[PDB]
XYZ file of N, CA and C in Angstrom:
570
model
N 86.333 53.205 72.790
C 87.358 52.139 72.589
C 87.604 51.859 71.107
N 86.617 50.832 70.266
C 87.161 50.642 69.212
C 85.508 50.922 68.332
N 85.327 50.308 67.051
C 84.578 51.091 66.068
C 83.336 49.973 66.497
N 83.398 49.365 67.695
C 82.343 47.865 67.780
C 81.554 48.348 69.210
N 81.690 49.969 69.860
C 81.187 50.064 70.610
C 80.672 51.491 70.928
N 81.200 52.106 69.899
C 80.955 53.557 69.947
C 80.156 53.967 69.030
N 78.925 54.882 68.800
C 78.331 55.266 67.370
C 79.186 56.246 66.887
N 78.011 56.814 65.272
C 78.610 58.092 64.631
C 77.443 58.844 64.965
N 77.537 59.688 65.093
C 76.204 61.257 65.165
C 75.500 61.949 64.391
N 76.093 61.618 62.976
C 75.541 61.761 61.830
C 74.131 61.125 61.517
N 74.786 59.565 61.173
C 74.383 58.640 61.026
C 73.111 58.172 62.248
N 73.092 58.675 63.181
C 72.567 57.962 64.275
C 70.827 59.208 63.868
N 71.266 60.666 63.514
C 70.175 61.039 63.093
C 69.281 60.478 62.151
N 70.164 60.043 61.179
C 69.844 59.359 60.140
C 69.029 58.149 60.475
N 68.876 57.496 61.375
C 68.473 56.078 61.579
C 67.002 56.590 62.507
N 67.298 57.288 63.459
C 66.272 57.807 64.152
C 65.251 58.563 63.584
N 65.416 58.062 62.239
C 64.558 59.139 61.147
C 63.446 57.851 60.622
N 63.603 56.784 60.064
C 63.100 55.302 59.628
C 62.396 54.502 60.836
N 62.914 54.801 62.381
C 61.743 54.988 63.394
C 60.909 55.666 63.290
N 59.236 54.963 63.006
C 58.154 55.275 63.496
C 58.031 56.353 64.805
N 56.787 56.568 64.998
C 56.512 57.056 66.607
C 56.086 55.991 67.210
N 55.704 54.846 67.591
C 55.812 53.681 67.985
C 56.871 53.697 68.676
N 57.696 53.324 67.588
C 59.100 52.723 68.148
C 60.297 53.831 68.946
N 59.107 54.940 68.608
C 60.071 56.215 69.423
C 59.579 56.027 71.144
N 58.396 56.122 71.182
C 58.131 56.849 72.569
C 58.622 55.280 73.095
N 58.380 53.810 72.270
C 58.938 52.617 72.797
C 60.239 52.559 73.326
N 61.222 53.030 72.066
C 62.557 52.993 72.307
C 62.882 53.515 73.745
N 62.270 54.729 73.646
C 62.916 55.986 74.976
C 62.654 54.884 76.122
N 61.591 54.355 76.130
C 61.221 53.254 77.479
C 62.466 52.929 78.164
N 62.827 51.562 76.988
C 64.277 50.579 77.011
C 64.845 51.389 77.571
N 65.208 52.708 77.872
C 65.895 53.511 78.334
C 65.488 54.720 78.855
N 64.614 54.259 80.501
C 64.172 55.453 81.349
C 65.112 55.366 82.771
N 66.105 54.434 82.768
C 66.481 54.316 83.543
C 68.434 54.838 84.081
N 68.388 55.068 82.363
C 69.430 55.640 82.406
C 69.584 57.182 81.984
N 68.888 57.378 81.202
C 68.614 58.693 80.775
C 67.363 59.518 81.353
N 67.250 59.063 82.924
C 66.244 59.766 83.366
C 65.777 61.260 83.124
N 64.180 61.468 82.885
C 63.757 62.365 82.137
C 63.338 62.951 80.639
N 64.697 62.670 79.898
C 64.529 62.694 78.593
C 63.120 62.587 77.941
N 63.010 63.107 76.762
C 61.809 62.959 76.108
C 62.343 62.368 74.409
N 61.999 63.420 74.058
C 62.972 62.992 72.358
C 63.541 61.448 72.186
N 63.560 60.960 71.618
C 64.759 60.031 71.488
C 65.340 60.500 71.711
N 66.092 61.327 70.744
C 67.170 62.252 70.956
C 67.698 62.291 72.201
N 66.761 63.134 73.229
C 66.518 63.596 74.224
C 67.681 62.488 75.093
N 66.625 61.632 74.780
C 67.569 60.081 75.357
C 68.815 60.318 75.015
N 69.119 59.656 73.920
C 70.565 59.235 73.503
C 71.121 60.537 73.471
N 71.481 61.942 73.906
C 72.492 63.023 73.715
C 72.637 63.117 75.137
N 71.891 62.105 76.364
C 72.232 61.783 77.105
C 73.225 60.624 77.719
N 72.702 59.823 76.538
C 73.724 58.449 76.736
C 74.889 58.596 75.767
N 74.751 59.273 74.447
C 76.085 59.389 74.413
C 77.202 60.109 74.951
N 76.764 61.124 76.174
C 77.413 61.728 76.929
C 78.157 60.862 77.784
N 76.963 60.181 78.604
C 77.368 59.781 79.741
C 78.031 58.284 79.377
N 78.404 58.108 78.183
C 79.317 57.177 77.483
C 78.916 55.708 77.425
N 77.820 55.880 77.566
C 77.000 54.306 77.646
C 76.210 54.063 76.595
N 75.855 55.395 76.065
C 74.975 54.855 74.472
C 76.206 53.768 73.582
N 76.522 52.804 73.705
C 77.669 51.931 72.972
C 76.643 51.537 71.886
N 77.686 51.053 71.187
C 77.179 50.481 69.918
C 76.460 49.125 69.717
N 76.390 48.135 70.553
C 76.148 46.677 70.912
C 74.826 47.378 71.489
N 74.636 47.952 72.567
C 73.850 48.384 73.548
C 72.712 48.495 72.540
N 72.661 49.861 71.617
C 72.776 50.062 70.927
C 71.872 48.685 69.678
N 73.116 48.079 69.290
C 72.182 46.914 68.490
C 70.870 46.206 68.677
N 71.441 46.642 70.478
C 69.813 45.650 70.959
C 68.887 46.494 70.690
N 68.487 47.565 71.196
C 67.244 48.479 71.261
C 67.030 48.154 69.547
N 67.751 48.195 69.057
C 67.092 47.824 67.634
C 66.841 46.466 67.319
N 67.692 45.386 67.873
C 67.019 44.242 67.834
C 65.651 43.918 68.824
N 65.473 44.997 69.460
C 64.305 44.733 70.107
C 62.739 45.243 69.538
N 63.318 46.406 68.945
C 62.363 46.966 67.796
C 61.757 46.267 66.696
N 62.476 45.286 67.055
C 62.468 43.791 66.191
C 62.378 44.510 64.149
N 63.673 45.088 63.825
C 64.084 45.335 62.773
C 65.131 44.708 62.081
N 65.231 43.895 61.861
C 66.254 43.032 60.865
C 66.237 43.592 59.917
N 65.672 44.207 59.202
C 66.144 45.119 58.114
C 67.107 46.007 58.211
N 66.735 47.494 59.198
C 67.513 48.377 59.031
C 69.002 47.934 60.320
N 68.740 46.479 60.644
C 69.816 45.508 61.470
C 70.992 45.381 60.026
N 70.535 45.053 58.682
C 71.495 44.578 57.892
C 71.676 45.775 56.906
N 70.514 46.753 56.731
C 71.066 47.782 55.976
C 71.658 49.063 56.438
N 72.251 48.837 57.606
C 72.999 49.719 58.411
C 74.445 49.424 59.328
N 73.586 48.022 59.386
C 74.577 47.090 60.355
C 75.410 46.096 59.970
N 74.635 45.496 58.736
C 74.959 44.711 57.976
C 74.504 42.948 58.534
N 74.713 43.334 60.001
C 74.375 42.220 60.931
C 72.712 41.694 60.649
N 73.115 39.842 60.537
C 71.846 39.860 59.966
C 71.193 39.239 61.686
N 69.744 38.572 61.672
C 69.472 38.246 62.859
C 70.440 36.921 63.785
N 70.645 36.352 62.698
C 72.144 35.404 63.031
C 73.371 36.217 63.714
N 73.684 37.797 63.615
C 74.894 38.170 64.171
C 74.881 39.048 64.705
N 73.545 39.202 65.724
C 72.871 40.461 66.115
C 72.688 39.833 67.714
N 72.233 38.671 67.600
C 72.257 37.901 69.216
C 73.581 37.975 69.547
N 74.977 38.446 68.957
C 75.955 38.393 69.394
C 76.585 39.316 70.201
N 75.422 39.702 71.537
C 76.126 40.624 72.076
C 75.343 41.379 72.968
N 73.967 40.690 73.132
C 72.816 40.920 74.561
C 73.572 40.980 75.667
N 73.167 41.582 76.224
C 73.719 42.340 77.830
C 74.657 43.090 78.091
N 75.410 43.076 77.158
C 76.503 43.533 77.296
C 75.541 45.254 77.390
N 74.752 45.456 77.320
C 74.215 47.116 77.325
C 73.201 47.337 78.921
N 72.932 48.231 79.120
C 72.349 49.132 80.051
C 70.768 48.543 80.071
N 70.317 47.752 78.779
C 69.279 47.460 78.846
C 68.443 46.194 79.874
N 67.889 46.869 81.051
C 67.267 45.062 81.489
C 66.775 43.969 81.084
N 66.959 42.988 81.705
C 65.873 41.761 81.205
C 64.865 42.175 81.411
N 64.344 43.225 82.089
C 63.036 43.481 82.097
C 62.623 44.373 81.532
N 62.838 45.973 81.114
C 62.727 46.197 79.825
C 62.088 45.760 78.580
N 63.462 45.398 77.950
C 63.121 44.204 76.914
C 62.002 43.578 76.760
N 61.647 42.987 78.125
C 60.107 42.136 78.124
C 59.522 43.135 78.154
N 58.812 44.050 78.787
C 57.653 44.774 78.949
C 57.319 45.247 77.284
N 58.363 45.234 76.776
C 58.434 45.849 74.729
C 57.772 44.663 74.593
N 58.172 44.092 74.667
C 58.545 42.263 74.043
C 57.133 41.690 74.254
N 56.040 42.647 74.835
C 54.963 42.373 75.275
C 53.953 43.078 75.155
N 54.671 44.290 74.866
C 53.496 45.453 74.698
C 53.358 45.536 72.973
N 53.638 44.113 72.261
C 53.346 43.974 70.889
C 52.691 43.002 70.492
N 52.551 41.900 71.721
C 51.529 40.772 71.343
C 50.325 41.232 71.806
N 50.115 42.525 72.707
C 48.604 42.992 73.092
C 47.930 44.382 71.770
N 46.791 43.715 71.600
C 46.513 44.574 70.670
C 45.711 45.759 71.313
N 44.833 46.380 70.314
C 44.112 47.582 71.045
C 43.078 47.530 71.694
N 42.702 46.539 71.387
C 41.325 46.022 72.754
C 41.740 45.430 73.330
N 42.779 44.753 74.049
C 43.312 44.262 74.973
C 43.886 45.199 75.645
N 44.671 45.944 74.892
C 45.586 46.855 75.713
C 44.286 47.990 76.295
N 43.593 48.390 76.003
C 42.571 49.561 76.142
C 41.853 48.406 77.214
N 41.998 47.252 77.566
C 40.966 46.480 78.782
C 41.808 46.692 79.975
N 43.490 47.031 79.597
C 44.366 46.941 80.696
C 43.950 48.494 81.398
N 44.167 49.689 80.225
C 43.872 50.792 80.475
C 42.991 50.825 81.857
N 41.671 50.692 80.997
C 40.551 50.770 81.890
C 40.074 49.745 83.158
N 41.484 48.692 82.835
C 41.667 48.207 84.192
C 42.367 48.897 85.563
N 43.299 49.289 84.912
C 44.800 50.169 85.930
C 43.802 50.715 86.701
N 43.091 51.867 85.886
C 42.441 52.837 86.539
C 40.922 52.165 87.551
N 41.011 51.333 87.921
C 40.040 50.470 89.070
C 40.952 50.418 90.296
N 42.204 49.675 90.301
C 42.804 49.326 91.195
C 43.180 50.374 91.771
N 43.394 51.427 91.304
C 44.057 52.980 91.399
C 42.988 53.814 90.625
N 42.162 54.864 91.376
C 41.840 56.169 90.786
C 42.336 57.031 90.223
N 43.880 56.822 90.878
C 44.618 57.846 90.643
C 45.738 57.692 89.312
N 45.026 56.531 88.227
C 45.870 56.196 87.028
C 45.362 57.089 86.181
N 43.687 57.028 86.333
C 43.266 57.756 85.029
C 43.050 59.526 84.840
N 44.547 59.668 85.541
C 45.153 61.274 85.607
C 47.256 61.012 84.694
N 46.733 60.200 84.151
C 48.008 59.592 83.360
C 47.729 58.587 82.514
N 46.499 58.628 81.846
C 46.392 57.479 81.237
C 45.103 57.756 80.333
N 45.578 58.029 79.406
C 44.480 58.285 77.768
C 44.431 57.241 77.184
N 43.307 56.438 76.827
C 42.937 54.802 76.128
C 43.875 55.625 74.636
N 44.986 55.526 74.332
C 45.319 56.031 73.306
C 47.372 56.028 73.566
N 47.324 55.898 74.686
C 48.960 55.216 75.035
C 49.339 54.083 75.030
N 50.538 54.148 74.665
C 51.000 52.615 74.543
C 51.031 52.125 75.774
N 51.214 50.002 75.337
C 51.315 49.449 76.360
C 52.652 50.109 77.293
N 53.739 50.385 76.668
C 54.979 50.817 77.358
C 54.715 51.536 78.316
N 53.659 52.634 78.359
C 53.650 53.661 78.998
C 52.496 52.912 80.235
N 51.630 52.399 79.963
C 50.649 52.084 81.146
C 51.534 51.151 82.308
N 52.423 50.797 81.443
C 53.273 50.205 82.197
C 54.425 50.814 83.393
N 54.802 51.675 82.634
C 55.269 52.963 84.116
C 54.563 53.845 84.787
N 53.547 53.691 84.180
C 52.496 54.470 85.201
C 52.436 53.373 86.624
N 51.842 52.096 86.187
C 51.666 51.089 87.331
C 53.098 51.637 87.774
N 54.195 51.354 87.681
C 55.544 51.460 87.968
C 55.577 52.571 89.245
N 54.792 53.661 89.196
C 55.023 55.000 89.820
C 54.204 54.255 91.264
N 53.144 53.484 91.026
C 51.888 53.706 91.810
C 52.472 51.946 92.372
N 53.881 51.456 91.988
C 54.163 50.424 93.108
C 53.326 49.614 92.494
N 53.069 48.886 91.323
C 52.087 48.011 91.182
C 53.295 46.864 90.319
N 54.148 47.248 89.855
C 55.272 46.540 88.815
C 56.310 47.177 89.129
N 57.627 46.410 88.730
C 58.943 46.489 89.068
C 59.225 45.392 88.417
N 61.095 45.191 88.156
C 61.359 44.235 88.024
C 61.515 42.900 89.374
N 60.785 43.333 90.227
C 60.332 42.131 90.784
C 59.256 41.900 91.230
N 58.116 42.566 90.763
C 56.917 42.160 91.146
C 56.245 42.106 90.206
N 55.846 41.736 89.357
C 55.039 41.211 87.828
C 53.980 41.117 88.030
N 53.581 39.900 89.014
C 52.054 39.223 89.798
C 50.559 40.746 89.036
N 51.263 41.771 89.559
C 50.042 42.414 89.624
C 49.476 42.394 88.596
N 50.712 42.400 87.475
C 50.012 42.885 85.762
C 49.833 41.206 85.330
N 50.583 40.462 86.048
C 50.380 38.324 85.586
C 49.039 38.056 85.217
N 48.511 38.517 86.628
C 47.063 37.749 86.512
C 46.481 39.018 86.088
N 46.457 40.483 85.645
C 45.834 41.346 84.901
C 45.481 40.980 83.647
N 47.136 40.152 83.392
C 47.000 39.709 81.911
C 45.831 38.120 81.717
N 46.009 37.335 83.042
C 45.640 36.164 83.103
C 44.352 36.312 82.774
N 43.870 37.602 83.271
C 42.698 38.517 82.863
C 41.537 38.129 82.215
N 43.020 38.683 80.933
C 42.357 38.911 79.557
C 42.606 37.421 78.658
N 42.900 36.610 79.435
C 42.811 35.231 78.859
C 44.192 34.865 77.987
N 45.322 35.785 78.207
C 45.884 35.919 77.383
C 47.172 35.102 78.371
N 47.273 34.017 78.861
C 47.780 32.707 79.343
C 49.128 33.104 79.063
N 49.578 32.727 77.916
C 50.944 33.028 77.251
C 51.621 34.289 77.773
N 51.280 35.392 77.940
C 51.691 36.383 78.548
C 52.262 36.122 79.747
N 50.976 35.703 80.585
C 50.615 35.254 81.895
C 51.957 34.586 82.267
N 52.102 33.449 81.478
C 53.227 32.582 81.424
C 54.621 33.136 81.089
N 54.636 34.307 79.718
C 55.444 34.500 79.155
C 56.504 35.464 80.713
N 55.611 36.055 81.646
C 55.608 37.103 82.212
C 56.473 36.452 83.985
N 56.105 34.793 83.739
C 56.736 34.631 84.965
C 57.809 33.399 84.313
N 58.097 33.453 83.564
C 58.942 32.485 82.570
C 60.025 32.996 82.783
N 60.135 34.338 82.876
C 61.129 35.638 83.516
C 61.359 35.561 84.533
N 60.571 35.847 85.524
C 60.139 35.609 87.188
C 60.697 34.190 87.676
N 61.218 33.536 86.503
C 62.264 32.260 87.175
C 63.446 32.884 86.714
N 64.132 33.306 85.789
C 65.603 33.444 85.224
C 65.743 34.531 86.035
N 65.135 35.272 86.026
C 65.732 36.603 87.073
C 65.937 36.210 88.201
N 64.441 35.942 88.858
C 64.513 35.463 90.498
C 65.362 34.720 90.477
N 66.250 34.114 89.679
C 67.038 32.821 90.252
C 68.147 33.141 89.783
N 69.072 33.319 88.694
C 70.515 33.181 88.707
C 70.607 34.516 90.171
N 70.246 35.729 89.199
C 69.900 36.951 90.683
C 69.868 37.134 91.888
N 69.962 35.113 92.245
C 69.807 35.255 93.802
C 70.858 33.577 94.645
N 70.712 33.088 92.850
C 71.269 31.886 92.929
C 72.559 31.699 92.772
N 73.171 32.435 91.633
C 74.408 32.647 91.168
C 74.938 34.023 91.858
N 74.843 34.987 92.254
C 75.167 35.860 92.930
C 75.169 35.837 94.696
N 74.974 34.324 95.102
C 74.884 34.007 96.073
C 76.184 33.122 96.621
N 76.537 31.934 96.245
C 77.852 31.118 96.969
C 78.863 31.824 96.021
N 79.367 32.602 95.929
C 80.385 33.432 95.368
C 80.944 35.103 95.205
């Protein structure tokens, strides 16, 4: 459409270059649902800019979720003031978002307690699961084995409630109201 929703290809190498590996195998997450399979970033996005949904807003978020305000204003120019201007409008879930949004307040002994938790409830985790993956990823593993979704949280709630880590706990069904409810509330008498 116009220059506020489409990338450049150049440039987009260029940026995917100042991502870490962190924020790579993270990024691809935000987006397993549309670019099923993919590996690469890349991998990802030469999928989404195909299938015409890698937009540019879309787009802003995965980087505002990367939580970069820097390369937000030295690329974008957009500072964190003009960067909220334009959530949802992309492919990305509310749930997504959180599972990132979460797999950065757990550190490595927390996250390595979840590890070697998964694999209790399920034997069959620690055939996908090296104390050495991110939270993102332990997180679709549960995903495969029916333990999380965007509507069932509970399992990893009190996993987290666990580890004493309350705020999570909280942060995790704080969600589990805005979803469960416009989702069922507002999409309901209308």
């Amino acid at each position: 459409s116009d220059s506020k929703e489409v990338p450049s290809l150049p440039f987009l190498r260029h940026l995917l270059e100042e991502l870490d590996s962190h924020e790579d195998s993270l990024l691809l997450f935000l987006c397993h649902d549309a670019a099923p399979g993919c590996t690469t970033v890349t991998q990802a996005l030469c999928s989404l800019s195909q299938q015409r949904k890698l937009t540019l807003a879309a787009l802003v978020e995965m980087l505002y979720v990367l939580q970069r305000m820097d390369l937000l204003k030295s690329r974008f120019g957009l500072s964190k003031e003009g960067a909220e201007q334009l959530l949802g409008t992309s492919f990305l879930t509310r749930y997504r978002k959180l599972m990132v949004c979460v797999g950065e307040e757990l550190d490595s002994s927390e996250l390595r307690a979840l590890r070697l938790f998964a694999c209790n409830l399920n034997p069959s985790l620690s055939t996908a699961l090296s104390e050495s993956s991110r939270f993102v990823e332990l997180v679709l593993a549960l995903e495969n084995v029916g333990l999380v979704s965007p509507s069932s949280v509970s399992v990893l709630a009190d996993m987290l409630r666990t580890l004493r880590r309350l705020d999570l706990c909280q942060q995790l069904v704080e969600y589990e109201q805005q979803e469960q409810a416009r989702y069922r509330y507002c999409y309901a008498a209308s």
